[PDB]
Amino acid sequence: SAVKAARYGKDNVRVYKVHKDEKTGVQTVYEMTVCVLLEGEIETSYTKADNSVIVATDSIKNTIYITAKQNPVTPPELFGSILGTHFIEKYNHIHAAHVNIVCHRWTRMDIDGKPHPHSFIRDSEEKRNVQVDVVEGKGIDIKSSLSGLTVLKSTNSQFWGFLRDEYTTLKETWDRILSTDVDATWQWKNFSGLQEVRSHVPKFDATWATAREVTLKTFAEDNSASVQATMYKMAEQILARQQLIETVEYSLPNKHYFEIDLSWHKGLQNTGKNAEVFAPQSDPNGLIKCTVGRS
Amino acid sequence: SAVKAARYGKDNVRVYKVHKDEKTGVQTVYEMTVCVLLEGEIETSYTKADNSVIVATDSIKNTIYITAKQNPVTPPELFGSILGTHFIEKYNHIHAAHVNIVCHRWTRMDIDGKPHPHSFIRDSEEKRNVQVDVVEGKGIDIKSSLSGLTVLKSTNSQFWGFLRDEYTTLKETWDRILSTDVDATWQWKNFSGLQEVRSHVPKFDATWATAREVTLKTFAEDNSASVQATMYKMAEQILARQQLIETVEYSLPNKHYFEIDLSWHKGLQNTGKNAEVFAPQSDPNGLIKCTVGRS
Amino acid sequence: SAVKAARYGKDNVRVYKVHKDEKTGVQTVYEMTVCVLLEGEIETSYTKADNSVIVATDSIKNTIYITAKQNPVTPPELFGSILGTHFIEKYNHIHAAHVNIVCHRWTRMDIDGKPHPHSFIRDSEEKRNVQVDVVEGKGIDIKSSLSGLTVLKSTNSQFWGFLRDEYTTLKETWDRILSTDVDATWQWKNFSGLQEVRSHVPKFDATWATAREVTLKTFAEDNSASVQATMYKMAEQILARQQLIETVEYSLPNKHYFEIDLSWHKGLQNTGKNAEVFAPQSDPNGLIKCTVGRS
Amino acid sequence: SAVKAARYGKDNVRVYKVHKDEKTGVQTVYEMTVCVLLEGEIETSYTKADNSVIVATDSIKNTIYITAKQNPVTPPELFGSILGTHFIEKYNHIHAAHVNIVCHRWTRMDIDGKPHPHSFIRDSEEKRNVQVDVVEGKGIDIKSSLSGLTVLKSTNSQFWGFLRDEYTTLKETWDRILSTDVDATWQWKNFSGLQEVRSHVPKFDATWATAREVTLKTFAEDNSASVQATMYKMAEQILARQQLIETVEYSLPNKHYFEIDLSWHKGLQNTGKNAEVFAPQSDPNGLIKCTVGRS
Ligand SMILES: Nc1nc2[nH]cnc2c(=O)[nH]1
Ligand SMILES: Nc1nc2[nH]cnc2c(=O)[nH]1
Ligand SMILES: Nc1nc2[nH]cnc2c(=O)[nH]1
Ligand SMILES: Nc1nc2[nH]cnc2c(=O)[nH]1
């Protein structure tokens, strides 16, 4: 036997960083969860019990803190590039670094119609993430994403015209609730190294804001023919707004809300046009994906 | 042996209800999770296998749907009173109903600086809850609450002057991060029955908004001497704003963010006044509670 | 306003302890999660920002480690009594200690039909817990419990004869799946202090083993008329086996497995006596409780 | 823009199946969670709102129930092959089916030293899984796995000789606790179709039992030089025992248990050779992976 692939590192490293404007007295906090996995010439640690090739996972954790201390942690696409680049340049036998970052929301509180200087609130569980792969001699691959964005529209969603055969019991509908947890990923064109990533810095936050806005507007306005059709429209718009993106990927659960027939109880009418009370279903759920790129 | 206490019912009943304004075309959704437990003369179901006294848990579930269909589901203190009252009046041998409701947020989306008629987003995992106990001949006891409100302030929090003995290693501090998940409960004065609850309807939503606002403002503005001191101030204000409240209860975790000493690495300064990078701690955590009432 | 009730302390303190037999070379591990909340004369910490009365939560955490170091951590009813007693004797103004302990399973591995000296496996998520309230001048109240015991029987469970009215749609049945997560608590008679608890040490583990065994045997053998009837039988037996127990409490979810009618598909028969494939339901679920004591 | 990749289907389909031996009266239950995602000529559902190409996710759910009704659900590698094969043969425009199955444990209860005919208990949260990809014209790819196997050894684990530089603070050790959650996957050689999978049926369960046993024995007996070294030894043995396996993959977290220095308290000795009380750390954790194949 032989080692076909190997990676190791530190997972679930929680990091918080505060920025203090001495001028204005305004404070800004950043909180994230970091994973860093390394690859290189480390086979002997597995095959020969040779630990000399191992950069201890505890040292990797130390390095994340130090890096966060000496560099900006935002935007995450930059911080992740700096962190991955560090491992491949510092260690001769390490040739790839895979860095995953999850940014948690800490939103400035508004007190009395005015932004508070140092108080924050977590508004929802929606995350902004980055996956950065830094490979010696192959540049920097970045995939940015937003996830945990949960939305629902109570009408203007349809589903009819689908295949019908002896396995089908689902009825066609012209009016239904559509609810989902949005997971959207945009993959950037490969970057030659850190200097190139630094040159595109302003595009990261703007592209994140754009993906979010397009996602929300398209969901709210589209008279949805299906989840498939609505998601393609979002992805089409994101690609058209940012040329440096190669592919957009969406992964959407269809969280079902079933009508409850109450007619067995005093002829109570609660179906079709009279539907008011529904039962949200925990499982199972439809799962719909699509990767859209440039023709 | 004998049955000293008994209750049974249906838990985790998810309910969704939509309101459609035919005039404006505006839709409003309500989503909640309901638990209903009953008590009464049901001992024989346990002792003698006598199921004749049992209102099937499946029937209790049916009843929640029917009740939601025929009545307003908001404010939750009213819907819960209606639901509990129903069981004790309908069934002769049922003398207490305990109804718990958790309201999930579905917040109208703003598209292009304007409220969307039928699209919603879950902004955070913060809940509004109610506990309603409807006891035959003893009226209606209601406890309302908000939970899952997660906040953090990066400065203006202190902790010094505490007891020091041979078990103490904690250092006094004049500047620290304060973060917590707020769980606040206000207990209403006992109500004689449904007609009395209906008479106070407008006070429910207003008191909920008040508890939230006071909680947020006090946390942000108080130069906190301790979690204990800050929570008492919140509770004091809520009691002063609403006379129909008998007691306010707060339960607050103190989620710790530790300084990271980086001086072993090139004399890097990251403690005290130079602290920028912290390590959020998952556990353990301080847990601080207090019940405040009227003197 | 005034402080009606107050308690504070440390939650989620994870503790591991290893015992090494120098003779046999056999090692035994104990892992638990501890919560300790204190009460006493601490009102001024809330009302006057007077921290002098506060035993820091960090010190409480230190104390748990020290106590675990100097005393046996098993059985948990003893360790919890020692820990609570410590706070009320050490601090003059602290009059009650509430200690909660959750024991996690680490079960000796069997390698080659033989017990391994120092390797363990977590077999299931079932917990053994204790709640200990140590109140100055009122002795020691202990509630022991087992939870997270998940079981299912595929037949020999019935449910018929229940009340039927206009809210009922559930059909009577003579054969069904019964599945639940067992939560059983036995409350001990009040103890005068530590010396009395020490005198009953051997009864703790034996009573825990007994509750478990009776729970499992009764569930498997009873031709269940209802969850209510089966749980009363368990509680009756536990009370008869241990006189020092005052009350047994059971709290049982009824996790439903619905039949799937497949007759719309080629007359496939999958209901009643032909039922083979079921759909486990995540929610909602029946919740059945009962507290049984001595007549 | 264009669709580069697309898949859709049903996730979280919970299925239970009971087998009743009319002879012996012995019942056997199987419980699983199934995901099925399809690919084929379905681009137009995204691009043109053409639902005619869509096999409704609800129909996919129906099909899982029907398939489970007409076929054995064990071993899971077979059931998954049958299910995936069904979609590609039945639908002309569907060319790949991806089926994921998670098997939950329901272990026959032993009552009075004897196997009970129809009562079961969930012993741990350990899963047996399968991933089956059925691609038209490319046969059947199966990856089997076990996950959620949580183990700990209190001694006979070392970690010394690792790289040391200015980022290192970790001390070398010759004696430590080693704890992890085992995730092991074995990939089978490609199968030509269902008839070939049926021919190897007996090898599935045996290979699963083998992977488990080797994993447990190697963990318990190896005087571990590192997680890397111990995992390679397991994978080496699995490959040697089953020729039809092409690659073994392990993914192991290193769950840390830190020593607690108690010397600041009365010179209490709790480090190195005197270590008895440890603090289990929730995060961060080391993450170590390796894919081992044939030379
Ligand atoms: N939008 C949408 N709804 C569905 N309901 C059942 N299947 C589907 C599907 O593929 N798409
Ligand atoms: N606010 C606050 N911080 C603490 N840190 C340690 N103990 C305490 C406590 O009781 N209150
Ligand atoms: N055992 C049992 N099954 C039920 N199914 C519906 N209600 C009940 C109940 O109260 N007990
Ligand atoms: N086994 C093991 N322990 C570690 N502790 C820190 N890093 C490592 C590592 O790579 N392997």
PDB file of C-alpha atoms in Angstrom, chain A residues 22-146:
ATOM      1  CA  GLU A  22      -8.788  56.286  18.253  1.00  0.00           C
ATOM      2  CA  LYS A  23     -10.212  59.282  16.403  1.00  0.00           C
ATOM      3  CA  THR A  24     -13.965  58.565  16.441  1.00  0.00           C
ATOM      4  CA  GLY A  25     -13.964  56.092  19.391  1.00  0.00           C
ATOM      5  CA  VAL A  26     -15.818  53.687  17.086  1.00  0.00           C
ATOM      6  CA  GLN A  27     -15.074  49.970  17.558  1.00  0.00           C
ATOM      7  CA  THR A  28     -15.592  47.203  14.986  1.00  0.00           C
ATOM      8  CA  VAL A  29     -15.545  43.498  15.753  1.00  0.00           C
ATOM      9  CA  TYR A  30     -14.861  40.533  13.483  1.00  0.00           C
ATOM     10  CA  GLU A  31     -15.578  36.964  14.484  1.00  0.00           C
ATOM     11  CA  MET A  32     -14.795  33.887  12.482  1.00  0.00           C
ATOM     12  CA  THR A  33     -14.158  30.151  12.550  1.00  0.00           C
ATOM     13  CA  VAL A  34     -11.082  28.971  10.734  1.00  0.00           C
ATOM     14  CA  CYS A  35      -9.905  25.614   9.380  1.00  0.00           C
ATOM     15  CA  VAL A  36      -6.426  25.160   7.841  1.00  0.00           C
ATOM     16  CA  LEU A  37      -5.338  21.825   6.279  1.00  0.00           C
ATOM     17  CA  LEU A  38      -1.845  21.378   4.803  1.00  0.00           C
ATOM     18  CA  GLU A  39      -0.421  19.018   2.113  1.00  0.00           C
ATOM     19  CA  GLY A  40       3.186  18.391   1.016  1.00  0.00           C
ATOM     20  CA  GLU A  41       5.952  15.911   1.614  1.00  0.00           C
ATOM     21  CA  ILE A  42       4.509  14.380   4.745  1.00  0.00           C
ATOM     22  CA  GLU A  43       3.961  10.768   3.725  1.00  0.00           C
ATOM     23  CA  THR A  44       6.696   9.559   6.046  1.00  0.00           C
ATOM     24  CA  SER A  45       4.745  10.773   9.076  1.00  0.00           C
ATOM     25  CA  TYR A  46       2.165   8.111   8.142  1.00  0.00           C
ATOM     26  CA  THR A  47       4.467   5.378   6.842  1.00  0.00           C
ATOM     27  CA  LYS A  48       7.563   5.618   9.034  1.00  0.00           C
ATOM     28  CA  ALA A  49       6.382   7.371  12.223  1.00  0.00           C
ATOM     29  CA  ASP A  50       8.641  10.194  11.154  1.00  0.00           C
ATOM     30  CA  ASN A  51       7.227  13.311  12.902  1.00  0.00           C
ATOM     31  CA  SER A  52      10.073  15.536  11.707  1.00  0.00           C
ATOM     32  CA  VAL A  53       7.967  16.547   8.702  1.00  0.00           C
ATOM     33  CA  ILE A  54       5.021  17.586  10.881  1.00  0.00           C
ATOM     34  CA  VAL A  55       4.221  21.201  11.606  1.00  0.00           C
ATOM     35  CA  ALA A  56       2.171  20.539  14.819  1.00  0.00           C
ATOM     36  CA  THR A  57      -1.549  21.354  14.525  1.00  0.00           C
ATOM     37  CA  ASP A  58      -1.119  23.428  17.680  1.00  0.00           C
ATOM     38  CA  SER A  59       1.509  25.546  15.804  1.00  0.00           C
ATOM     39  CA  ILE A  60      -0.929  26.029  12.933  1.00  0.00           C
ATOM     40  CA  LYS A  61      -3.416  27.368  15.514  1.00  0.00           C
ATOM     41  CA  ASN A  62      -0.741  29.737  16.930  1.00  0.00           C
ATOM     42  CA  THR A  63      -0.036  30.938  13.375  1.00  0.00           C
ATOM     43  CA  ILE A  64      -3.672  31.837  12.742  1.00  0.00           C
ATOM     44  CA  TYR A  65      -3.686  34.063  15.851  1.00  0.00           C
ATOM     45  CA  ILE A  66      -0.368  35.697  14.894  1.00  0.00           C
ATOM     46  CA  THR A  67      -1.479  36.274  11.310  1.00  0.00           C
ATOM     47  CA  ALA A  68      -4.779  37.788  12.458  1.00  0.00           C
ATOM     48  CA  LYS A  69      -2.780  40.033  14.819  1.00  0.00           C
ATOM     49  CA  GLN A  70      -0.499  41.360  12.053  1.00  0.00           C
ATOM     50  CA  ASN A  71      -2.931  41.617   9.160  1.00  0.00           C
ATOM     51  CA  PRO A  72      -6.460  42.766   8.370  1.00  0.00           C
ATOM     52  CA  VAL A  73      -8.994  39.949   8.768  1.00  0.00           C
ATOM     53  CA  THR A  74     -11.285  41.455   6.181  1.00  0.00           C
ATOM     54  CA  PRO A  75     -12.233  40.867   3.535  1.00  0.00           C
ATOM     55  CA  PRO A  76     -11.959  37.097   4.285  1.00  0.00           C
ATOM     56  CA  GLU A  77     -10.759  36.253   0.757  1.00  0.00           C
ATOM     57  CA  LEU A  78      -7.633  38.365   1.507  1.00  0.00           C
ATOM     58  CA  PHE A  79      -7.023  37.080   5.046  1.00  0.00           C
ATOM     59  CA  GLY A  80      -7.342  33.459   3.781  1.00  0.00           C
ATOM     60  CA  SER A  81      -4.846  34.138   0.916  1.00  0.00           C
ATOM     61  CA  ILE A  82      -2.342  35.636   3.341  1.00  0.00           C
ATOM     62  CA  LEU A  83      -2.723  32.702   5.733  1.00  0.00           C
ATOM     63  CA  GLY A  84      -2.399  29.974   3.087  1.00  0.00           C
ATOM     64  CA  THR A  85       0.517  31.759   1.354  1.00  0.00           C
ATOM     65  CA  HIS A  86       2.318  31.897   4.677  1.00  0.00           C
ATOM     66  CA  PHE A  87       2.446  28.104   5.089  1.00  0.00           C
ATOM     67  CA  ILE A  88       3.723  27.317   1.571  1.00  0.00           C
ATOM     68  CA  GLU A  89       6.495  30.016   1.669  1.00  0.00           C
ATOM     69  CA  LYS A  90       7.580  29.325   5.215  1.00  0.00           C
ATOM     70  CA  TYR A  91       7.867  25.539   4.916  1.00  0.00           C
ATOM     71  CA  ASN A  92       9.838  24.022   2.084  1.00  0.00           C
ATOM     72  CA  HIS A  93       8.124  20.651   2.141  1.00  0.00           C
ATOM     73  CA  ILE A  94       4.552  22.035   2.409  1.00  0.00           C
ATOM     74  CA  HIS A  95       3.144  22.617  -1.077  1.00  0.00           C
ATOM     75  CA  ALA A  96      -0.598  23.236  -0.588  1.00  0.00           C
ATOM     76  CA  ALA A  97      -2.626  25.023   2.119  1.00  0.00           C
ATOM     77  CA  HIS A  98      -6.414  24.768   2.261  1.00  0.00           C
ATOM     78  CA  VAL A  99      -7.982  27.453   4.388  1.00  0.00           C
ATOM     79  CA  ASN A 100     -11.700  27.604   5.207  1.00  0.00           C
ATOM     80  CA  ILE A 101     -13.208  30.620   6.979  1.00  0.00           C
ATOM     81  CA  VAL A 102     -16.743  31.142   8.269  1.00  0.00           C
ATOM     82  CA  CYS A 103     -17.631  34.752   9.219  1.00  0.00           C
ATOM     83  CA  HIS A 104     -20.286  35.181  11.895  1.00  0.00           C
ATOM     84  CA  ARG A 105     -22.500  38.298  11.908  1.00  0.00           C
ATOM     85  CA  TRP A 106     -21.976  40.934  14.566  1.00  0.00           C
ATOM     86  CA  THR A 107     -24.133  43.842  13.406  1.00  0.00           C
ATOM     87  CA  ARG A 108     -23.740  47.258  14.942  1.00  0.00           C
ATOM     88  CA  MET A 109     -26.706  47.974  17.208  1.00  0.00           C
ATOM     89  CA  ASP A 110     -28.902  51.013  16.463  1.00  0.00           C
ATOM     90  CA  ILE A 111     -29.832  52.721  19.694  1.00  0.00           C
ATOM     91  CA  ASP A 112     -32.333  55.610  19.437  1.00  0.00           C
ATOM     92  CA  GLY A 113     -32.058  55.745  15.622  1.00  0.00           C
ATOM     93  CA  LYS A 114     -28.278  55.950  15.822  1.00  0.00           C
ATOM     94  CA  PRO A 115     -25.312  53.524  15.363  1.00  0.00           C
ATOM     95  CA  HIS A 116     -23.762  52.491  18.668  1.00  0.00           C
ATOM     96  CA  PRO A 117     -19.969  52.798  18.912  1.00  0.00           C
ATOM     97  CA  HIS A 118     -19.311  49.388  20.464  1.00  0.00           C
ATOM     98  CA  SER A 119     -22.416  47.233  20.880  1.00  0.00           C
ATOM     99  CA  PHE A 120     -23.380  44.491  18.477  1.00  0.00           C
ATOM    100  CA  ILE A 121     -26.105  41.991  17.859  1.00  0.00           C
ATOM    101  CA  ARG A 122     -26.156  38.723  15.933  1.00  0.00           C
ATOM    102  CA  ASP A 123     -28.923  39.150  13.370  1.00  0.00           C
ATOM    103  CA  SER A 124     -29.477  35.670  12.084  1.00  0.00           C
ATOM    104  CA  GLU A 125     -27.299  32.740  11.524  1.00  0.00           C
ATOM    105  CA  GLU A 126     -26.507  33.639   7.919  1.00  0.00           C
ATOM    106  CA  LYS A 127     -22.736  33.177   7.231  1.00  0.00           C
ATOM    107  CA  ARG A 128     -20.250  34.599   4.726  1.00  0.00           C
ATOM    108  CA  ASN A 129     -17.593  31.988   3.925  1.00  0.00           C
ATOM    109  CA  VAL A 130     -14.462  31.536   1.912  1.00  0.00           C
ATOM    110  CA  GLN A 131     -12.554  28.510   0.744  1.00  0.00           C
ATOM    111  CA  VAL A 132      -8.954  29.326  -0.279  1.00  0.00           C
ATOM    112  CA  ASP A 133      -6.605  26.750  -1.836  1.00  0.00           C
ATOM    113  CA  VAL A 134      -3.018  27.979  -2.115  1.00  0.00           C
ATOM    114  CA  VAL A 135      -0.983  25.563  -4.231  1.00  0.00           C
ATOM    115  CA  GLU A 136       2.739  26.056  -4.818  1.00  0.00           C
ATOM    116  CA  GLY A 137       3.225  26.998  -8.483  1.00  0.00           C
ATOM    117  CA  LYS A 138      -0.527  27.120  -9.280  1.00  0.00           C
ATOM    118  CA  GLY A 139      -1.585  30.351  -7.641  1.00  0.00           C
ATOM    119  CA  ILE A 140      -4.640  30.889  -5.488  1.00  0.00           C
ATOM    120  CA  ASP A 141      -8.130  29.483  -5.985  1.00  0.00           C
ATOM    121  CA  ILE A 142     -10.895  31.208  -4.102  1.00  0.00           C
ATOM    122  CA  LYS A 143     -14.551  30.215  -3.695  1.00  0.00           C
ATOM    123  CA  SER A 144     -16.659  32.688  -1.755  1.00  0.00           C
ATOM    124  CA  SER A 145     -20.126  31.971  -0.449  1.00  0.00           C
ATOM    125  CA  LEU A 146     -23.081  32.938   1.578  1.00  0.00           C
TER     126      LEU A 146
END
